[PDB]
Structure formats: structure tokens, C-alpha cells
Design a protein around this ligand. Structure first.
Ligand SMILES: c1ccc2[nH]c(C3CCN(c4ncnc5[nH]ncc45)CC3)nc2c1
Ligand SMILES: [Zn+2]
Length: 278
């Protein structure tokens, strides 16, 4: 019988209009002393269902869920490695082997989601956590983490849209192909220092993304350039990964040729950065 009193609050991990996340310590039971992330929501149904349905090394684990008063409590594994964002921000630009590692782990997580009919939509690097070893954990399954909200209804444009596919921005209907686009935008950000389509303002940024005139930096390897070219396409159906082979298609691309997927999945590959050493 789990209740809020079973946990002590340690610090705030994040707050927005639609929930708050705490680092907490369990103080009862066999897991006495163990550290978790606690998300509290004001009652969302998709979020819980998603987290209960997925089980994968590169996706955050849900340990407990319960509702007391009007609040929903989600107890997740505590991820101490921070946001992928912070590594990018410190490094400026990743070496290709660095980028390859992260993108490869993300692709497996995306594959798992898609098999469960789940679409991640937004792979901006603040939406990817690292665990204590430095491996990827997809975490962003909730409504919106913002405090100021675009549109008096839906939460597509609240944060940056720089990693979202044209067809999402147009609201013209979409599928799992948007995730492969977003993987490309993230990849582009890793290898060049900024997402592919940026404007002086929101309106300009939308227009650039819709026009999708890709600038392939010449200093990248041919494999990296070819993958970016095949991910960042306005025609969703014709992106790598958009076909029946999904993640398998992307993982077969020459940019990932040095990846042992079995070793990757089992997390036996050493991450480029170790959060414990930071
Ligand atoms: C509303 C407003 C701001 C928010 N910031 C989040 C983030 C916060 C950091 N996250 C985690 N950190 C550590 N262990 C974690 N385990 N699981 C997640 C997690 C990831 C989510 N969710 C929000 C909801
Ligand atoms: Zn919002």
C-alpha cells in the first residue's frame, strides 16, 4: 500500500503548470532508503498508460503509480545523469562517434515505442535523460513541461519546435515518421551546434522548417551527410525509418555500421561521457 507519506522530498527536479517532479527517498518497505523521481499531477491518462506499457533499457521505468486526493503520483527510477542537452551544451559539437552512440540508443527506444503504437514527437535534447552510467533514457511522455503556453488548447508550440516535423507543425496528420525526422534534427544539432532550421522568430522558424531546404555542412562524413539527407525530408513517407522496417531501416544505415546492437541494447557499450565522473 503506497502513499505519499512513504516518500520524503529531497529537491525539485522540475515544475510547470501541469505537474511537478521531485527527487525523493523511500522511507518504508524493502526499498527503504532508495532514491526515486516522483511526478505529481493534478487530476495524463496517456502518460501513465504509456509508462506502464513500455519496458526497455533506454526508456525510463515506472516503479509505482497511485492517486491520493486529487493528485496522481508517478514514481519513476531516479536518473542522475542529467539531460542530454547538458552534454551538448558543454561539448558545443559532438564528435561523430559520440553522436552515433546516443542516436543509436535512441533509435532502439524509438523502435520499441513504435511497436507499441507510441510516437515520441519531440527529440529536442532536453527531452532525453542519461542514467548514472551515461546511457540514454527517453522520459518525456507527459502533457507539457512549460510554464507559459502557446495556444489556449493544445501543447505543440509551447516550447521550441525546432526538432518537430513539418507535418506536426501544420497539424495535417502524422505518424511515427515524425520521430525519424526529429532524430535527424537532433543529429543535426549534435554534429553542427544548432538544429537544422532556425529563424529570427517563431514565424520565421516555422517557415524554414516547412520549406525544409537542408544545408549539409561539408565537414561531416559522407555517412553522416547521407543519413541527415534521408531523415530531414519534407515528404514523411520517404524518410528513412518511415517504411515498414521502422528502426531496423535506420539502424541498417552505414552511419551506424560499427554498432553491435546486441551489445548496445545490453548496455555493454561504454558511453562517451560518464555523469559520475562529472
Ligand atoms: C512538468 C514541469 C517540468 C518538468 N520537468 C520534467 C523532467 C525533470 C527531470 N526528469 C527526471 N529526472 C530524474 N529522474 C527522472 N526519472 N524520470 C524522469 C526524471 C525528467 C522529466 N518533467 C516536468 C513536468
Ligand atoms: Zn504548454
Amino acid at each position: 500500500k503506497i502513499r505519499p507519506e512513504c516518500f520524503e522530498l529531497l529537491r525539485v527536479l522540475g515544475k510547470g503548470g501541469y505537474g511537478k517532479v521531485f527527487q525523493v527517498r523511500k522511507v518504508t518497505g524493502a526499498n527503504t532508503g532508495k532514491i526515486f523521481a516522483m511526478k505529481v499531477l493534478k487530476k495524463t491518462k496517456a502518460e501513465r498508460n504509456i509508462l506502464e506499457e513500455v519496458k526497455h533499457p533506454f526508456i525510463v521505468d515506472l516503479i509505482y503509480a497511485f492517486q491520493t486526493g486529487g493528485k496522481l503520483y508517478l514514481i519513476l527510477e531516479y536518473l542522475s545523469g542529467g539531460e542530454l542537452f547538458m552534454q551538448l551544451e558543454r561539448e558545443g559539437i559532438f564528435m561523430e562517434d559520440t553522436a552515433c552512440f546516443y542516436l543509436a540508443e535512441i533509435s532502439m527506444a524509438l523502435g520499441h515505442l513504435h511497436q507499441k503504437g507510441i510516437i515520441y514527437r519531440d527529440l529536442k535534447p532536453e527531452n532525453i535523460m542519461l542514467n548514472h552510467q551515461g546511457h540514454v533514457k527517453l522520459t518525456d511522455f507527459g502533457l507539457c513541461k512549460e510554464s507559459i503556453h502557446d495556444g489556449t488548447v493544445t501543447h505543440t508550440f509551447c516550447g521550441t519546435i525546432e526538432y518537430m516535423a513539418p507535418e506536426i507543425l501544420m497539424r495535417s496528420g502524422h505518424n511515427r515518421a515524425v520521430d525519424w525526422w526529429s532524430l535527424g534534427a537532433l543529429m543535426y544539432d549534435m554534429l553542427t551546434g544548432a538544429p537544422p532550421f532556425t529563424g529570427e522568430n517563431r514565424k520565421k522558424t516555422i517557415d524554414k522548417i516547412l520549406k525544409c531546404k537542408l544545408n549539409l555542412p561539408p565537414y561531416l562524413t559522407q555517412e553522416a551527410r547521407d543519413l541527415l539527407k534521408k531523415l530531414l525530408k519534407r515528404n514523411a513517407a520517404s524518410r528513412l525509418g518511415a517504411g515498414p522496417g521502422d528502426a531496423g531501416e535506420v539502424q541498417a544505415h552505414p552511419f551506424f555500421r560499427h554498432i553491435n546492437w546486441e551489445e548496445l541494447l545490453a548496455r555493454k557499450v561504454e558511453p562517451p561521457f560518464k555523469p559520475l565522473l562529472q
